[PDB]
Design a protein around this nucleic acid. Sequence first.
DNA 1: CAGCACGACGTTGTAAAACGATTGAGACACAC
DNA 2: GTGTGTCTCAATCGTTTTACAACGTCGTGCTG
Lengths: 113, 113, 100
Amino acid sequence: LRTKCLRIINQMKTIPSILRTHPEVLAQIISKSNDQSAIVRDTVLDLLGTYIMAYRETIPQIYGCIISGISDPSTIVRKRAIKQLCEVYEATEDLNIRVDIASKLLTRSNDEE
Amino acid sequence: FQTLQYLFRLYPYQRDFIIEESLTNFSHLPTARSVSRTYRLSNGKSIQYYSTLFVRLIQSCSIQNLFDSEIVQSESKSTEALHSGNLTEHLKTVESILSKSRHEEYRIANHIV
Amino acid sequence: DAYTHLSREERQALLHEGPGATVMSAYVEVTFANADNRFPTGKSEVVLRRTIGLKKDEYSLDKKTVSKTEVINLLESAGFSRSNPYYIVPQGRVTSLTNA
DNA sequence: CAGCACGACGTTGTAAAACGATTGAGACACAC
DNA sequence: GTGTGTCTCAATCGTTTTACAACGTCGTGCTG
């Protein structure tokens, strides 16, 4: 049931404005960034991508729960986390965070898959 | 379904019985999308025409038609002081009828849902 | 039918260990010019391949990545033998079917 | 005759390869 | 001519059985 709910809200509202009134609910899903289920991990990565696209002013404090997924065993989390780093790179303008995109990209030049 | 709706509204002594089979034939339906989509709607959507049966029965649901002929009079001149002439309890006879509408609509709606 | 009951160090024993770069996966692919011996005669040049990573293996047909049971059934309908085949003799094992 | 060796043989408790039931994501449509 | 809505291809998370490796059990071959 915990898988279903976070899977549903990934496209349910189409408005992250619910989290404009519930940052503690956003704080709930931030905690589940390190769940054992590889399925629920990507859901958190998808939701957190969408939350930046509109409510853009949370570049810094969100950023941490993003790159923490690139060094993960599952491929789905890695193949998804990367594409979100693409979008973040253009919208952001602090060069000091741009370099952190690059170092985490080049480190994954070679992988098991 | 027009005949079925007429007999539904007019002869309630076996109003249930038709319902007793109207859903049964619902089991033998096209089990694929390309065949289920049928006659288009006005606002630009395509549905399965068999579905309009269900709403059509409650589209009748014995809506009242004796709107008039329950009160001694029409409106008064100053209702914000006293219902002069007309009787509020006679105006409060509509919910008796509406009970035959309301408390039967869900009663039909729950044999099916 | 060999290299079946493998394990971690087995499915690593058959890769290449060298100084170039750590290699992850390996693959072998053969090309058969059949006429009608293999049943799908619609394909005149059948091709098979088996890739192996450190944590994956996949049989295939002509880039069709089918499971194992289907290629087993395919080779079985043809004139092959699943177990230790008589038409193959490994190193120094030639005194096989004369002392069993 | 009888005692030792020893080597194949049949159960038995396992760990791992594999198996089926879920999801999301490209390529055919149309039909105004 | 552009959005449509339906059809077909890939990972992953419990089960399952199934190969495998340890352990008594016999039976033939000897040597004293």
